[PDB]
Every structure is written in C-alpha cells, then in structure tokens.
Design a binder for these strands. Structure first.
Ligand code: GFF
Ligand code: NA
Ligand code: NA
Length: 321
DNA sequence: CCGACCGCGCATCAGC
DNA sequence: GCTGATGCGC
DNA sequence: GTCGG
C-alpha cells in the first residue's frame, strides 16, 4: 500500500481507456504499470525512480511527478467531472454492459442504473441479470461460503453420475481467503478429445436443488450463470458461477491452468523453453529444435506435467508467483 | 519508426 | 434462413 | 502507453 495513491491513479486511467476511449492496449499498459508499481517496496519519490521499472515509461513517469507534487491528475479530475464519460465508465460495471453498450446507452440519455430499470425493453438477457445482481456481483466470496458452495456442487454432480469428476479452481484452490466467482471444471470418461449432454444434466440438477438461480450463457462446454446458498437469517448474496466441461485427456491441463496462479502459470513458459515444452490449457509436448511442436502426450495426474518439464510436485495450496 | 499487445465459448447482430 | 463478425466476460 | 525489433 506504499504507492496506493499512485496505483489507484493508474487503475482509474486504465478503466477509462478500456471503457471510454476503447483503447484495450492502453488499458493494459496502465494495468501492467499499476501492477509492478503495486509491488515496488518503497514509497516512490519521483517519476524517474518509477521509470526504472518495466512497463512504466515517460508519459506515466510524468503523471507520477504531477501526482507526487500536487495530489491530482488534471486529466483525471476533468474526466471525473465529465458527465458523458463518467457515466459510460460506470455503466460497464453492470455485467453484460461493456464499452459499446455503455456508449450506446449514454447517447440515448440512459446514464444511471435507475435509468436502466426504466428501460428493460433495451437490455438483453445477460444485462438484466447483471442489473438485478449488480450489488451482489461486486461482493467478494468468503472462503467458508465457497466450501459451503463446493460441498453442494460436488454433492449434486456426483448425485447425477458417480463417474463425473469436478474441481473448483481459481484463487479458491490456491488456498485464498476470498474469491470473486466460483469456477468449476468438469469431466466424464465418455468424452475425450475424439468424442452426450454431460454439461446440461449437471446444470439441471443444480437448478433442481435450486442452487443455480439464473443463466447468463450456456452451451455444450461452458455455462455461466448465478447461484445462491439457502437459508431464518438474511439470504446470501447471489453469486457468479461458471462451469466448464473439459475432455479427460486435457482436464488436468486446464485444471492446472485455471488453478494457476496467473503470475505462476506463465513463469512456466519462460521455463517451457529451458526444458522446451509447449504448455497450453489443453495440450503439451516438447518442441522441435527448429520448429513444429509434436503430438500431445498423455496426462492422467496433475503434475505429470511438471515431470515432463523438469520440476517436482507443487500442490496448489502453497505457492503464488 | 513501427507493429504487437490472448484468444476462446456463447449471445446477438449485420449482411446476405 | 445462414454465416461470418462483433461484443462480452474472463 | 510501453516495449522490442
Ligand atoms: O483474458 C484472460 N485470458 C485467459 N486466457 N485466461 C484468463 C483471462 N482472464 C482470466 N483468465 C483465466 C485465469 C483465471 O484464473 C480464470 C477465470 O477467471 P476469474 O474467475 O474471473 O479469475 P480468478 O483467478 O478466479 C480471481 F479473479 F482471482 P477471483 O475469482 O478469485 O476473484 O481463467
Ligand atoms: Na521503464
Ligand atoms: Na460489465
């Protein structure tokens, strides 16, 4: 939190690029930037200092200098008071409104949530569901509600076919104390890369125990919707839940992948070169000395995959970067 | 100077 | 009605 | 906006 005033400044700037300017790369520059700065362990004293870091450059080093000397960014203040632009930026928080719809809406004077409630005839399904839950969807998820949720997802999934195999990945599988959503990955033997309605029946069971309350999108391998835990007391906030059906020969590659960590899984691609392997969500192999990657291996355990790329076991629970 | 910067499932929209 | 494109979430 | 060829 040493340079929190700085990283907030860049995260603000990042959001406006994505949401108003629609400059996705500029958005990511500021993110990268606000990330490395959020790990620098000294109170940054100048833009020059900062520019020593990777992904801070000139325009940002001068935005820090102005920040450190005056406490503000004139472009930031001006944009915060700009009605059009602030309202665009805001609406995008509603799930299913990205930069495009938020722009369209603010053109026709729909600039607040209250306005979104006045005009359902204009929101697609996903966006209504987003509107309805806008508050809950910004809450985080205690680890203990996740285990309460995990115990439900595993119970029903098994109660529909004991030969299912399902894991809850994300920051929750890394031991963390809170989660944003819940990401479940699902497999069944009767379906490999060369291969029924395996995902639908799992969704239908969790609607039948009334665990899943809405659907944002559903297909034959991905489901994105809404769940909630039961209850005398106050009802729990409705949560985001995603279910992905993966093949068996690729499950543990995607489990590994979606478990992470983010900061970690990519460290194995600067290390998928000294052992020289192609590690993506599905497949894996060695590469050619001058080119093409081979024909993917077998996988059956998780860390069969760090065997193949010279590392020992690594349980998710005990490491980040 | 000058292009790269992640790419994949699903819902929904142009454009036939 | 079909298909390729674009928006969205992540 | 920053990096790297
Ligand atoms: O743009 C992305 N591209 C990509 N190939 N993968 C990806 C992108 N965003 C996220 N992800 C991966 C990694 C991530 O772990 C999962 C699911 O996204 P989620 O659930 O929103 O992130 P997370 O790690 O679980 C979290 F944000 F830390 P949470 O949910 O605990 O707050 O897919
Ligand atoms: Na730099
Ligand atoms: Na949104």
């Amino acid at each position: 939190t040493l340079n929190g005033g700085i990283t907030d400044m860049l995260t603000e700037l990042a959001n406006f690029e994505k949401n108003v300017s629609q400059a996705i790369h500029k958005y990511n520059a500021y993110r990268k930037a606000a990330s490395v700065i959020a790990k620098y362990p000294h109170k940054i004293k100048s833009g020059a200092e900062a520019k020593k870091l990777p992904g801070v450059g000139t325009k940002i080093a001068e935005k820090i200098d102005e920040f450190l000397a005056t406490g503000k960014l004139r472009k930031l203040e001006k944009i915060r008071q700009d009605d059009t632009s602030s309202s665009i930026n805001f609406l995008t928080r509603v799930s299913g409104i990205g930069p495009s719809a938020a722009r369209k809406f603010v053109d026709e004077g729909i600039k607040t949530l209250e306005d979104l409630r006045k005009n359902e005839d204009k929101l697609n399904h996903h966006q209504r569901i987003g509107l309805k839950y806008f508050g809950d969807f910004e809450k985080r998820i205690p680890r203990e509600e996740m285990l309460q949720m995990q115990d439900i997802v595993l119970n029903e999934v098994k109660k529909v076919d004991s030969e299912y195999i399902a894991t809850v990945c994300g920051s929750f599988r890394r031991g963390a104390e809170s989660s944003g959503d819940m990401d479940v990955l699902l497999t069944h033997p009767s379906f490999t890369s060369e291969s029924p309605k395996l995902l639908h029946q799992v969704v239908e069971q969790l609607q039948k125990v009334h665990f899943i309350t809405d659907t944002l999108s559903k297909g034959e391998t991905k489901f994105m919707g809404v769940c909630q835990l039961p209850s005398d007391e106050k009802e729990y906030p409705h949560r985001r839940i995603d279910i992905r059906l993966i093949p068996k020969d690729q499950y543990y590659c995607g489990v590994l992948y979606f478990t992470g960590s983010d900061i970690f899984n990519k460290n194995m691609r600067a290390h998928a070169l000294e052992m020289g392997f192609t590690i993506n969500e599905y497949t894996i192999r060695p590469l050619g000395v001058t080119g093409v990657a081979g024909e993917p291996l077998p996988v059956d355990s998780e860390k069969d995959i760090f065997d193949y790329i010279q590392w020992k076991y690594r349980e998710p629970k005990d490491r980040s970067e």
